[PDB]
Scaffold this active site. Structure first.
Site, PDB file in Angstrom:
ATOM      1  N   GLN B 251      19.467  38.675  62.811  1.00 18.75           N
ATOM      2  CA  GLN B 251      20.485  38.094  61.945  1.00 18.75           C
ATOM      3  C   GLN B 251      19.902  37.095  60.955  1.00 18.75           C
ATOM      4  O   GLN B 251      20.521  36.838  59.917  1.00 18.75           O
ATOM      5  CB  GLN B 251      21.567  37.413  62.785  1.00 18.75           C
ATOM      6  CG  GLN B 251      21.360  35.921  62.993  1.00 18.75           C
ATOM      7  CD  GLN B 251      22.344  35.332  63.983  1.00 18.75           C
ATOM      8  OE1 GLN B 251      22.609  35.919  65.027  1.00 18.75           O
ATOM      9  NE2 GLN B 251      22.887  34.165  63.661  1.00 18.75           N
ATOM     10  N   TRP B 283      29.290  40.435  62.630  1.00 23.36           N
ATOM     11  CA  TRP B 283      28.253  39.489  63.013  1.00 23.36           C
ATOM     12  C   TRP B 283      27.059  39.517  62.066  1.00 23.36           C
ATOM     13  O   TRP B 283      26.019  38.935  62.387  1.00 23.36           O
ATOM     14  CB  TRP B 283      27.789  39.767  64.449  1.00 23.36           C
ATOM     15  CG  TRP B 283      28.802  39.437  65.511  1.00 23.36           C
ATOM     16  CD1 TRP B 283      29.862  40.203  65.903  1.00 23.36           C
ATOM     17  CD2 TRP B 283      28.834  38.261  66.332  1.00 23.36           C
ATOM     18  NE1 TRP B 283      30.556  39.573  66.907  1.00 23.36           N
ATOM     19  CE2 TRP B 283      29.946  38.381  67.190  1.00 23.36           C
ATOM     20  CE3 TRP B 283      28.033  37.118  66.423  1.00 23.36           C
ATOM     21  CZ2 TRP B 283      30.278  37.401  68.125  1.00 23.36           C
ATOM     22  CZ3 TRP B 283      28.365  36.147  67.349  1.00 23.36           C
ATOM     23  CH2 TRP B 283      29.476  36.295  68.188  1.00 23.36           C
ATOM     24  N   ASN B 284      27.190  40.203  60.922  1.00 21.05           N
ATOM     25  CA  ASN B 284      26.189  40.292  59.855  1.00 21.05           C
ATOM     26  C   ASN B 284      24.765  40.458  60.367  1.00 21.05           C
ATOM     27  O   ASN B 284      23.831  39.887  59.794  1.00 21.05           O
ATOM     28  CB  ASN B 284      26.243  39.059  58.945  1.00 21.05           C
ATOM     29  CG  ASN B 284      27.650  38.693  58.528  1.00 21.05           C
ATOM     30  OD1 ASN B 284      28.627  39.121  59.135  1.00 21.05           O
ATOM     31  ND2 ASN B 284      27.758  37.872  57.490  1.00 21.05           N
ATOM     32  N   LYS B 285      24.585  41.231  61.435  1.00 21.13           N
ATOM     33  CA  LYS B 285      23.262  41.570  61.939  1.00 21.13           C
ATOM     34  C   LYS B 285      22.833  42.969  61.510  1.00 21.13           C
ATOM     35  O   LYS B 285      22.003  43.604  62.172  1.00 21.13           O
ATOM     36  CB  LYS B 285      23.216  41.428  63.457  1.00 21.13           C
ATOM     37  CG  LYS B 285      23.563  40.032  63.963  1.00 21.13           C
ATOM     38  CD  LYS B 285      24.395  40.072  65.235  1.00 21.13           C
ATOM     39  CE  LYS B 285      24.638  38.684  65.801  1.00 21.13           C
ATOM     40  NZ  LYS B 285      24.803  37.670  64.728  1.00 21.13           N
ATOM     41  N   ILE B 286      23.397  43.457  60.408  1.00 19.68           N
ATOM     42  CA  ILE B 286      22.982  44.696  59.762  1.00 19.68           C
ATOM     43  C   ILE B 286      23.128  44.497  58.260  1.00 19.68           C
ATOM     44  O   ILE B 286      24.101  43.892  57.798  1.00 19.68           O
ATOM     45  CB  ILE B 286      23.809  45.902  60.263  1.00 19.68           C
ATOM     46  CG1 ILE B 286      23.919  46.988  59.184  1.00 19.68           C
ATOM     47  CG2 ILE B 286      25.176  45.447  60.749  1.00 19.68           C
ATOM     48  CD1 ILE B 286      25.335  47.279  58.717  1.00 19.68           C
TER      49      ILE B 286
END
Ligand SMILES: NC(=O)c1ccc[n+]([C@@H]2O[C@H](COP(=O)([O-])OP(=O)(O)OC[C@H]3O[C@@H](n4cnc5c(N)ncnc54)[C@H](O)[C@@H]3O)[C@@H](O)[C@H]2O)c1
Ligand SMILES: NC(=O)c1ccc[n+]([C@@H]2O[C@H](COP(=O)([O-])OP(=O)(O)OC[C@H]3O[C@@H](n4cnc5c(N)ncnc54)[C@H](O)[C@@H]3O)[C@@H](O)[C@H]2O)c1
Lengths: 129, 312, 312, 130
Positions: B251, B283-286
């Site tokens: 992230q 979760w904006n982890k991509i």
């Protein structure tokens, strides 16, 4: 031990990490969100130890900066591993350790003019004339 | 009755990428069929190939149970051949790799055998794999008692990834994941390291040695690799702590640029294990423009299919 | 364009055992129906009651995603009432309980809402619970920043369970699990403590403080409690590291005397999260004569049914 | 001191060194087990000096250090304050020890009171007065 913030650090700045003064060589920013506030990861080299040290912190986090206290002096003895230096200003002839670096371990001779910095309580040679 | 030597007849055999060479075109069969997992397999194999090309940080994240199968030798092979250069896993991975690297033999069993008969015979069952008592806990206890005093003398407070290299240093099994990681200086990140036989035996010996673990240094390593890389990719098998930890640290660079997830868990129970790539956007982890793929299936079937495709 | 305040309309509401008094007889309804889960519910309900009468060590083990729901308030109440006196959980339980204890509001959402839209609006989705960015990472980062200096000055190397008490000591939320655990001096055992926002913030502040975690002390506590107890029970919800760690330590006392497992995972993939109690009799982790029950279903449905039955 | 025994040989009342402090074993519990390794024992003990509860889980064959006990018998001369001066009945010698600050002891003190003090690992502790 002057103070600043992590976001104010840039390449070439100096900062104390793990107690050792360090020279910043890389700064990477990370956007806000799940972890919290906006953060920076700073990569720095220890001036004395030479080790790679990293610090990840919010951009507003307070960090300690060492003060350089640059001096210029000269060598009297040779003493092998240790070297006896004379500061151009104020005499104060003292003993330090030979620079284990390649470009500084050569050009060493009696009465050679050098430039040594004094940071946090420990001196280091940088150049030799 | 059935005696011990009837049950422990055929050892589990580790495979390598060489065993999959003649099936490297198998994804073409599923592309033709195109039934419900074929898109995930076709896209996953393509994302894997692109990750090897364009990603300089490549994660292999997996759960422990795979290491009791023949997939253990495959993951060692994938690390040896440079496909992945950081591992995020669990304490159970360390137990299985250490036990099988130091003489512990795992045996092919069956789901349909009397489990109470095993406890009498001193055999652990894991899936349909039989782990004799003296092949798992005896071996890990002996190894830690033997080698920790020298390791702890050298470094009294040690990151977990260095400790795992030290034990990888002393392994001779060429199918070993810990040996492969140490030979390649590939860090093995195990946040839950105290869980399992290895972690329990670390604790037992810590009573007698001036020895401690500093997981803040494992955090510093994975943090530094994520920040300083250009692009990152991951093959994430299963869920749990090793999936979340991989996704969590990515992230800080706006997510994994490439990701292939192989799982059996579903989404309706709200678990992280069954969370889709259309869950890590929140979760904006991509990355906003990224190639991600999820395949639902048994890892011992899906993973050999994907890994064979690496030779196509 | 949809607006933020439209989505964050209804906060998630914690419940307590009070809310289930009306339904304390509901197990009889499923007993009559004798559906497929009914036997597990009926038998699990009896095992829970016998556990409270007979077991002096009573585990509450659960995965993190429940603490984002109204169940968080229930687990706090079961601890305050003494039903369970040791917790094994994950790093995400700490995040959710700290976030919600210091003003972080979780909101009711939906499984459908487009996730790219949420990333724009700075909202995480967890299941169908919406976590605004400022409710989760901002709160945990501020809380650790504020309180760790004093905690680290008192103790420079601290067990994980003592660290969680120090934060429970500072919480005023009566629905908080960490607060409940502090009030009752119930230890919260988190082997994977470094995994999450709380653990990441611990690491960040460890850069500026002479502060370290000694997880070997958490290990000593749970080991000491298992050896010194007469009988042990456990309500285990979900799988993963928290389930395995609970089961692992009870192996030293012949296994759990009482156990109720609530899970959605299945067994065909060989994971620990989906392993029945018929499994782990080979792992010598349950007693030869023990009362264990497994229920397959969503925890937000099964747990309120089981907890309500405590009041019958 | 540092005489050596095995964990399996320890029973309640025995003495053992844990974290550098001599301790009196108060509880011993066994685990047959096998999924983590060999048969193991868990000993719970109380530090003779600090009074803290120390615990040790190990295989029964694990080697541990035992403190050597020296049960001397002495008598007090002076009181002055913080410390008190005592004379050993054998090996004539004057030395100083703390007040045992517990209540059952340190409120039995009087000039020329015979006491029994044990010497272990380089420190002494008062036990009885009569
Ligand atoms: N092999 C063992 O059973 C074993 C042994 C020692 C310790 N442990 C411990 O158990 C704990 C479990 O950790 P975890 O949650 O990361 O692993 P896990 O076994 O609990 O699996 C979690 C998720 O991974 C997925 N998964 C597992 N195997 C799969 C497969 N073959 N194919 C597809 N999906 C699969 C499932 O969806 C599952 O819900 C670890 O902490 C470990 O230290 C396990
Ligand atoms: N809310 C989150 O998902 C979250 C947030 C922050 C950190 N984390 C971290 O992610 C990691 C995930 O580990 P984990 O395996 O313990 O969590 P998990 O959510 O992956 O749960 C795994 C297993 O729990 C069971 N489960 C989950 N929800 C259930 C439900 N509602 N009802 C019944 N069973 C259910 C499933 O069998 C599932 O396979 C942890 O280390 C945690 O600290 C998670």
């Amino acid at each position: 031990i002057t103070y600043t913030t992590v976001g104010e650090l840039k390449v070439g700045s100096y900062v104390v990490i793990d107690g050792e003064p360090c020279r910043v060589v890389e700064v990477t920013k990370a956007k806000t969100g799940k972890h919290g506030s906006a953060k920076a990861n700073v990569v720095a080299i220890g001036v004395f130890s030479g080790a790679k040290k990293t610090l990840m912190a919010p951009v507003d986090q307070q960090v300690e900066v060492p003060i350089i206290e640059k001096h210029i002096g000269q060598i009297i003895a040779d003493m092998g591993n240790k070297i006896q230096v004379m500061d151009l200003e104020s005499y104060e002839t003292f003993e330090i350790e030979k620079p284990t670096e390649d470009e500084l371990a050569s050009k060493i001779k009696p009465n050679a003019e050098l430039e040594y910095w004094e940071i946090m309580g420990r001196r280091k040679i940088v150049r030799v004339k | 009755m059935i005696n011990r030597e009837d049950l422990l007849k055929n050892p589990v055999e580790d495979i390598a990428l060489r065993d999959l060479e003649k099936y490297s075109d198998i994804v073409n069969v599923f592309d033709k069929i195109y039934g419900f997992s074929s898109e995930g397999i076709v896209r996953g194999s393509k994302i894997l190939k692109e990750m090897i090309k364009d990603a300089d940080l490549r994660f292999l994240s997996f759960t422990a149970n795979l290491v009791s199968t023949g997939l253990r030798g495959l993951f060692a092979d994938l690390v040896k051949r440079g496909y992945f250069n950081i591992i995020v896993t669990t304490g159970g991975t360390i137990d299985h790799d250490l036990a099988r690297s130091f003489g512990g033999v795992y045996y092919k069993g069956s789901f349909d055998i009397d489990d109470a008969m095993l406890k009498d015979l001193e055999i652990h069952r894991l899936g349909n794999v039989l782990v004799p008592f003296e092949s798992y806990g005896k071996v890990i206890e002996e190894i830690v008692r033997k080698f920790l005093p020298e390791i702890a003398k050298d470094k009294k407070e040690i990151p977990a990834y260095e400790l795992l290299w030290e034990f990888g240093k002393r392994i001779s099994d060429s199918n070993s994941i810990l040996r492969a990681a140490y030979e390649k200086k590939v860090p093995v990140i195990v946040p839950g390291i105290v869980d399992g036989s290895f972690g329990t035996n670390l604790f037992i010996q810590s009573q007698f040695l001036n020895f401690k673990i500093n997981l803040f240094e494992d955090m510093r390593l994975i943090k530094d690799l994520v920040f300083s890389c250009k692009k990152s990719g991951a093959l994430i098998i299963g869920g749990g702590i090793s999936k979340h930890h991989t996704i969590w640290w990515n992230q800080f660079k706006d997510g994994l640029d490439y990701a292939v997830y192989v799982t059996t868990a579903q989404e309706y129970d709200g678990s992280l294990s069954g969370a889709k790539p259309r869950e890590a956007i929140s979760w904006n982890k991509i990355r906003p423009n990224a190639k991600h793929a999820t395949i639902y299936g048994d890892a011992t079937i899906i993973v050999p299919i994907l890994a064979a495709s690496l030779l196509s």
